[PDB]
């Protein structure tokens, strides 16, 4: 995020980090329950990648994070990589995340849920802070 | 250029109609735009959330999908519209 601000450690308990085998952060994700993570189809996650929960500072070695294995990758069949439409992937975890003060689920809306233009929302992540 | 610590940013939702001024025909029904307010999602942010507080709870409204190749803070970010995909998420969770 460009022009963002550092968050309060653990205040976005659903925010996960997708990391490859080498420890490289490549995409964000959100826990929707203990066994499932929602992410972007285009992140191209495989079962060799790891889900990291309860993390704040990727630099620290003293935080109590959960490194969760991926059991299966569910790419929405409607996903059109050409148009990047319906860009969603579900990740089914091998071991269930342990909910704590720093790891919990975000709520999903109903299909009829209305989010009007002008509504202030929030986005989070470890993406570049400067291009 | 990658942060060790988790970043956050407040941003407004736009209408698909209004987002088409920036992205034209690239905006489909299953997409929702946000930003163009001095902030921007950037490389590495993808797959993450766009949440809106409602009736007191944070609700997943979008998924960081695509945007400006330069993470321009004056152009809208594109997110997967969760309302259009929630039924599939529910069918998938049910069945697995």
């Amino acid at each position: 995020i460009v022009n963002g601000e550092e968050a309060v450690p653990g205040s976005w308990p659903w925010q996960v980090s997708l990391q490859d085998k080498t420890g490289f952060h490549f995409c964000g994700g959100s826990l929707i329950n203990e066994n499932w993570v929602v992410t972007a189809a285009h992140c191209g996650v495989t079962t060799s990648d790891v889900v990291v929960a309860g993390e704040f500072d990727q630099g620290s070695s003293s935080e109590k994070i959960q490194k969760l294995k991926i059991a299966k990758v569910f790419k929405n069949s409607k996903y059109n990589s050409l148009t990047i439409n319906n860009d969603i992937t579900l990740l089914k975890l091998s071991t269930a995340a342990s909910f704590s003060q720093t790891v919990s689920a975000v709520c999903l809306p109903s299909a009829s849920d209305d989010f009007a233009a002008g509504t202030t929302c929030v986005t989070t992540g470890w993406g570049l802070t400067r291009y | 250029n990658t942060p060790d610590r988790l970043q956050q940013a407040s941003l407004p939702l736009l209408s698909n109609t209004n987002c088409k001024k920036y992205w034209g025909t690239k905006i489909k029904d299953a997409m929702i735009c946000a930003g163009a307010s001095g902030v921007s999602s950037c490389m590495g942010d993808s797959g993450g959330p766009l949440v809106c507080k409602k009736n007191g709870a944070w609700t997943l409204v979008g998924i960081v999908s695509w945007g400006s190749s330069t993470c321009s803070t004056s152009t809208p970010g594109v997110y997967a519209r969760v309302t259009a995909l929630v039924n599939w998420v529910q069918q998938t969770l049910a069945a697995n």
Binding site: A7, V106 | Q8, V51, W58
Partner: peptide, 10 residues
Amino acid sequence: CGVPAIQPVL
């Protein structure tokens, strides 16, 4: 869901 134990400060 969607109610953090540690409140975000925006």
